Design a protein around this ligand. Structure first.
Ligand SMILES: [Zn+2]
Ligand SMILES: [Zn+2]
Ligand SMILES: [Zn+2]
Ligand SMILES: [Zn+2]
Length: 370
């Protein structure tokens, strides 16, 4: 079982764990409570294993959508921030950590895709998807293309498809209606048709994937790409003079990317729930706390209003949060699995001609709602 009188924290070792450990040291100095941070390989898979036998870390950091499965297994303790604390973070982030009407984790950071552009090729990036065709023809005259991004995964194609009305699962009253899927409505059809038309008109290639798109942008062959905060470092090394901004609109409406929320949950079997809450609320989710974590490894945008306003001074972070706020929270229900499979196939089939847009989405909708 977990030891009382101390805190063990788990988080992927590639994130700012050193920062969390520093906040832990500060905690130990003020309370005498030792905080040990660990980053086991595949800790996300190990948590349910050790948590089952009443073992594991007191606190676990991971993406919100995954906490859904954890909460269904009752592995997470319900957190109870007072209204004063909840007001410290952006409202939409609390929605990401709510399971069956209960709050099961503290939101930490927010990730979402943004439009990334080459400032030398396009000092002023386009605000609309509609302009992409004309922009590409202009750039092609100079041996450059307008846009290249991963068309193989729903995470990257969904922003446009959802813009005019598409959606995964209808969210209402803090609950997802698994029988109300918006994959084959008029909005989704319009979005995918535009995407497919771009391919038919040679402005994009159906085979472009993550690596192909990243190489093209980082080598200055294409003026724009679509990616997240995790791709910036690779661009920094390429020396490309890039900018990060709000995604283009479609039919005057904002692209809606899925939003991922790094969250901190408390082990249901932890005998240190009170101290765990004190650490997270009064030490980590503070400007100094998040700053320590962010300096170790960039968090992207954060859920804490006060610190996000500071980080937002970086236009890349401001763009990340803007797209996140206009986006769709990644559903934390098991049905998203079918949604991902279904939509990935639908997009590939429509982009290749194997199916029309209407047929591809109709089949995806059917499967998802089965
Ligand atoms: Zn033990
Ligand atoms: Zn590790
Ligand atoms: Zn995840
Ligand atoms: Zn992550």
């Amino acid at each position: 079982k977990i030891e009382e009188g101390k805190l063990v924290i788990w988080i992927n070792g590639d994130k700012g764990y050193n920062g969390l450990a520093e906040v832990g040291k500060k905690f130990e100095k003020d309370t005498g409570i030792k905080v040990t941070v660990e980053h086991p390989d595949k800790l996300e898979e190990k948590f349910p294993q050790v948590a089952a036998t009443g073992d594991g870390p007191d606190i676990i950091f991971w993406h919100h959508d995954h906490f859904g499965g954890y909460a269904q297994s009752g592995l997470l303790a319900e957190i109870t921030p007072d209204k004063a604390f909840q007001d410290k973070l952006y409202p939409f982030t609390w929605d990401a950590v709510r399971y069956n009407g209960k709050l099961i984790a503290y939101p930490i950071a927010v990730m979402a895709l943004s439009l990334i552009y080459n400032k030398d090729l396009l000092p002023n990036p386009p605000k609309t998807w509609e302009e992409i065709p004309a922009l590409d023809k202009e750039l092609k005259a100079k041996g450059k293309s307008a846009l290249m991004f991963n068309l193989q995964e729903p995470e990257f194609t969904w922003p446009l498809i959802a813009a005019d009305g598409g959606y995964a699962f209808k969210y209402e009253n803090g609950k997802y209606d698994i029988k109300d899927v918006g994959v084959d409505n008029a909005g989704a059809k319009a979005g995918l048709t535009f995407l497919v038309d771009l391919i038919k008109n040679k402005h994009m290639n159906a085979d472009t994937d993550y690596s192909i798109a990243e190489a093209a942008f980082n080598k200055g062959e294409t003026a724009m790409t679509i990616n997240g905060p995790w791709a910036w470092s690779n661009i920094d090394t390429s020396k490309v003079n890039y900018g990060v901004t709000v995604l283009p609109t479609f039919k005057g409406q904002p692209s809606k990317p899925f939003v991922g929320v790094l969250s901190a949950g408390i082990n249901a079997a932890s005998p240190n729930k009170e101290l765990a809450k004190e650490f997270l609320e009064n030490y980590l989710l503070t400007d100094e706390g998040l700053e320590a974590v962010n300096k170790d490894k960039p968090l992207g945008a954060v859920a804490l209003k006060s610190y996000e306003e500071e980080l937002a001074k970086d236009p890349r972070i401001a763009a990340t949060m803007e797209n996140a706020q206009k986006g769709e929270i990644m559903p934390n229900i098991p049905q998203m699995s079918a949604f991902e499979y279904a939509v990935r196939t639908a997009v590939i089939n429509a982009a290749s001609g194997r199916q029309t847009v209407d047929e591809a989405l109709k089949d995806a909708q059917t499967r998802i709602t089965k």
